[PDB]
Amino acid sequence: KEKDIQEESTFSSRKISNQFDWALMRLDLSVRRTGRIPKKLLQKVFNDTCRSGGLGGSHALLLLRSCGSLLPELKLEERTEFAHRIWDTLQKLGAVYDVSHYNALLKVYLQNEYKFSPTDFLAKMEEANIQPNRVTYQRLIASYCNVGDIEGASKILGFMKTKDLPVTEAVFSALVTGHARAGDMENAENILTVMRDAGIEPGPDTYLALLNAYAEKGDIDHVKQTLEKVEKSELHLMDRDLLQIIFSFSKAGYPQYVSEILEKVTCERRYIPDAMNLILLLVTEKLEDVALQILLACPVSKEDGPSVFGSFFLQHCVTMNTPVEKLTDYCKKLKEVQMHSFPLQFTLHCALLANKTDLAKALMKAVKEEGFPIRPHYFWPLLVGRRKEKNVQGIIEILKGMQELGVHPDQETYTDYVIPCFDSVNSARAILQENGCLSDSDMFSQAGLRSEAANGNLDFVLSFLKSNTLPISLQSIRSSLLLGFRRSMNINLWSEITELLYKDGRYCQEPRGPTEAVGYFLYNLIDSMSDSEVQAKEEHLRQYFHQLEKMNVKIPENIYRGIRNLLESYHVPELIKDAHL
Amino acid sequence: AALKERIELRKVKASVDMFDQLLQAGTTVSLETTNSLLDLLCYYGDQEPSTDYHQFGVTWRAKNNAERIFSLMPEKNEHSYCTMIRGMVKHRAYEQALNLYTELLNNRLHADVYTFNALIEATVCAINEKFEEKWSKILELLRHMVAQKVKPNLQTFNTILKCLRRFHVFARSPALQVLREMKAIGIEPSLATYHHIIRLFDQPGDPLKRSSFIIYDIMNELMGKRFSPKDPDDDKFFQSAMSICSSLRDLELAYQVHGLLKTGDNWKFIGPDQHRNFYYSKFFDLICLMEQIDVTLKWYEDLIPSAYFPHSQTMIHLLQALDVANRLEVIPKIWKDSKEYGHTFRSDLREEILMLMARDKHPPELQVAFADCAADIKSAYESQPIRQTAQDWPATSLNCIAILFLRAGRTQEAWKMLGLFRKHNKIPRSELLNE
Amino acid sequence: VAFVRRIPWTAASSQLKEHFAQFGHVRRCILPFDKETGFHRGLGWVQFSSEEGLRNALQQENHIIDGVKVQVHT
Amino acid sequence: SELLSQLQQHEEESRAQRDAKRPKISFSNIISDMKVARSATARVRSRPELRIQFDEGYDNYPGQEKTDDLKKRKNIFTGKRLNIFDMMAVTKEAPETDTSPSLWDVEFA
After folding, report:
1. Strand partners, C72
2. Which of A225, A376, A466, B168 is spaced 20 to 30 A from B183 at the CA atom?
3. C26-30 and C2-5 strand pairing
């Protein structure tokens, strides 16, 4: 697009260094639409941050905060490794880490269940020699509470008094978590009473920790009690709180109560992305059966049933190596509700991008049972993958899988994939002949002919045609040859091959006209050659047409008119003269 | 002639019933009269206007009188189509309005300025597509507007800016191009125009910064400009401008915004009540934070109660400003005013006052005044109207009152507080016991 | 030459040909399959033997291939 | 702090020795009520929006010198404009009072 207006002046000069804010939106918009930031997308923003080089403390802070619960697709450990890698990269780029930066790292650690000694991180802060703040101390208490260390938590709170820091609701929520995680439900209930005694009415976060506490132990009776209290109380109802309880039950290993808690889920203003994130997390946790229950409870897009709120589930199931039965079962349910017209095919695509033949074969065989038309184009990307792998037996297994399904590789399959992959075309056919898999190896021999014709080795083209005993197609050679001529053109070659032809000509009989069609071949060639290219082929064309006169195999008159018209467009007198002769 | 009366009286039902009866009799109804009937029907959506006595969703209904009458019309001029398109857009019939505009083009009929303004909103709301697509669609309507020799009015540009609010990330720079186009053409941006821009340039709810600096250019332009009512959204500017001044925490910018409000008759654009309270809440909160206490107290006297009645949170901000300024001799006055403004029983405010008074020791005179205010706050806790439901004595409040009595020398009164602690199960801090 | 857009990855040049053959004799169907992936970018070019075929391919607003409506432009 | 750093080590050692939970019941009365409990005042209202505010709620209030850079000499009124509508110098207005104001114009006024 004329340089895309210099990408709109390199994207308006990167928003005058505010691209980072612009990128914050693309991130935020993804959370609004999906609730998840695609790993790829984040890598782009991060890679763009390194590309830009100029980082901002807040901008680097965002990336760190993005590595926490905002990556439901990735496992907790992968999030931490990612976060660690970013932190290091940010430091290599000269990121001045303030209290905020280290605080965000604590949140990421806490969100990703990254177990660490609160003393070690405090020591990291001491090496930086940056005074910690309340949030740091509060999050360090949460770290000690996530591990159920009440004594440590109380000791940090004791120092908190020396610093004179206000106790926030987050502190009380963390206290509940610790006693719940330690199994002392009575103590966790005492926090609820002490909070009321201190005059701080328990918040819905504190109740979510209470709700989550019960889910960990599987005390559905208490879950129902605290639920009813929340319903009765002024406390609004957020599905992000509820959806989190299913995760607790799911993570706790009581999916029977999940169904009960899921039934409690009432579709509200905008919690699709949260359920979208939960479903992703469940498949990450290999709890696809529960994810399916939630997936079915989600509302189908009003405009189109075939909405992609199962695509993110299917794709992540494929990425997670969900059992073929499980994955296929999910696709079937999506196909039944019209949630996907082509669920399996889409899974086949991403599974093909993963470059796994075993899955592709099973999925492809499930495409035939579903009744969608199979095509070699389905196996085509997979063959590309193995071509890069250079696995002689691996690619052979693809052909066997295609036979099981009934697909047969045509010529285009070889020329595009099997022909380039194998070091030698003739050795490839020999290995393929050893297997006996190919319905016909002539298509392979012809495939090498195309490549050598396309490459312009017209000498090979002719010599090949002779040796081979099976029939070949001339018209296809003509179109491939005129391409080869543009690639490799030698006047001497055309004469040499013609003399070679006279020596040991095979077949002899041709349905293609001895001379009338030879003209058609020349006409098609001239038409393909660009005016500038034909101008360059001025001296040689004259000689070739003088050779035509001495041979006396004049071209057809009707085709002659065609050529002459092409030469008039070129406006070169030598070419027009060549036609007259 | 008798039907025209009902149209002037805005009797949607009587006019339709009479119009049908007129049509059944076979008497000729002038196109102008029928056009006036459509205007009345299209504007109100075939619903009786609210009378003295006898939101979500699309109000346009397929089986409406306007559609039936529209087809009945033997001759349909440009105005009949225009008012019908405008009615559909007004009533959220975006797809139906665009379809009617297509029919309008098929008849080779030039649309007026007002139809084009409504159509811009339709394209944005009707379909859901990327900004690039919507922007191309909007630009296409502008190109159609030029082809038909239709001159754009101020509303044409204000609707674009309002419509572009959805696409915050992508419309920022395009929105400036629209503003720059207005200045070249000669359409003078009203307050609504700038209101839409400053909103557009500060949409993200994430902690972002330096995107709101758009305002500085706008303020320099608007400095000392007497405004007249041009767009129905002119009243929303000041509230938005003051909200940005609070976010940027720039007191000098706030005084420039307020200065503009006071010039000439600009104060009349503050808007309805809830607009005025929000404006003054954000304005006064910024003064206490970013200005000297000596000037804050002057603004406090001038604005309250003449201008607005303070929210309980603004009284807390004022108390915090007095603390930072180390001017705690005024705290007793703040309590008196707080009670006069209906904050006698605000738990948050009562707790804050007591804590500040008891935080540190003060001289005998200041300690006595705090004891009297504490005794008054104590009386308010005793006479709570929440008592009907449940009377709560926050631990902190009880402790602060007892300490303030002890420090002032009213031991008799402090001794009584000990019974309350155990009564209410409130743990006294060591400081109270040590003292 | 008709410019087709929004072609589903499942639909190859052969499928484009048969659907566009009803409108005009397709001389050449050029579907550029993205390298390595083997899936076209969602766009293609259909050269009809006569301009009438190109016109007929533009008259129809709904070009459905593999259940996906493709966009055709002159 | 460094002294707190020494304390931290005592925290881990003591906890390892205790193994089981200590009898630190009453939670030290919030370490003798700690210091400040005003945080509730944000949550006493307990609105749904407020939860979202505290859900995303962290020390974002202090930005300090958040944007020291300024004065890029960029005036919005100067720059590329949309050239769709041609510039019109001046407008000639005819009163046309007789023309009956259309209901839409009356309601707009």
Report:
1. C4
2. B168
3. unpaired
**Pick among D85, D91, D106 to test the B interface (most B CBs inside 10 A):** D85
DSSP state of A114: -
- The C-alpha atoms of residue A469 and residue A462 are separated, in whole angstroms, by 13
Look at residues B305, B381, B397 and name the one whose alpha carbon lies nearest to residue B344.
B381
Nearest Cα to Cα of residue A251 among A150, A368, A113: A113
Nearest to B252 by CA among B301, B279, B290: B290
Secondary structure of A414-469 in HEC code, one letter for each residue: HHHHHHHHCCCHHHHHHHHHHHCCCCCCHHHHHHHHHHHHHHCCHHHHHHHHHHCC
Nearest to A136 by CA among A248, A128, D28, A180: A128
Experimental method: cryo-EM
- Judged by CB atoms closer than 8 Å, whether chains meet at C67 and A381 is answered as no
* Torsions phi, psi for D62 (to 5 deg): -85, 110
- What distance lies between CA A26 and its chain's CA centroid? 18
Beta bridge partners of C3: C45, C73
Question: What angle, 0 to 180 degrees and rounded to 10, lies between the N-to-C axes of helices A288-297 and A272-284?
Answer: 160
Q: Do D46 and A122 touch (CB under 8 A)?
A: no
Q: Give the chains touching B; criterion: ≥3 Cβ pairs < 8 Å.
A: A, D
Contact D46, A235 (CB under 8 A): yes
DSSP H helices in B251-392: 251-262, 273-290, 293-303, 312-325, 331-340, 347-359, 364-382
Experimental structure resolution, Å: 2.8
Say if CB A506 and CB A478 are below 8 A apart.
no
At residue A273, φ and ψ (nearest 5 deg) are -60, -35
Contact A320, A279 (CB under 8 A): no
List CB contacts of B91: < 8 A, sequence separation 6 or more: B45, B58, B59, B60
Helix (H/G/I), strand (E/B), else coil: A174 = helix
Q: Do chains C and B touch (3 or more CB pairs under 8 A)?
A: no
> Residue A384 and residue C10: Cβ atoms within 8 Å?
no
What is the chain D residue with the closest CA to B39?
D103
Residue D79 · residue B176 · CB < 8 Å: yes
Contact yes or no for B211 and A18 at CB 8 A? yes
Cα(B248)–Cα(B236) distance, rounded to whole angstroms?
A: 19
Burial of A271 (0-12, 13-18, 19+ CB in 10 A): buried
User: By the 8 A CB rule, do A144 and A178 touch?
Assistant: yes
Hey, what's the torsion of the CAs at B198, B204, B210, B211, to 10 degrees? -40
CB A31 within 8 A of CB A273: yes
Token couple for A98: 């303030």
What distance, in Å, lies between the first and last C-alpha atoms of chain C? 7
The DSSP letter of residue C43 is E
Quick one: DSSP state of residue D27? G
**Are D7 and A158 spatial neighbours (Cβ–Cβ below 8 Å)?**
no
DSSP reduced 3-state for C64: strand
**Residue D23 one-letter amino acid:** P
CA closest to B397 among chain A residues: A199
Q: Are A29 and B169 a contacting pair at CB < 8 A?
A: yes
Which residues make beta-bridge pairs with C30? C45
3-class DSSP state of B342: coil
Cα separation, B208 vs A126, in Å, equals 29
Neighbours of B327 (CB within 10 A): 14
Q: List chain B residues with CB under 8 Å of D33.
A: 395-396, 399, 427, 429
Q: Which residues have a Cβ under 8 Å from the Cβ of C34 and sit 6 or more positions away?
A: C40, C41
Task: Give CA separation, B330 vs A241, A571, B338, in Å.
Answer: 45, 100, 12
Picking from B197, B206, B278, the residue whose alpha carbon sits closest to that of residue B243 is B278
Query: Cα–Cα distance between A93 and A95 in angstroms, integer?
Result: 6
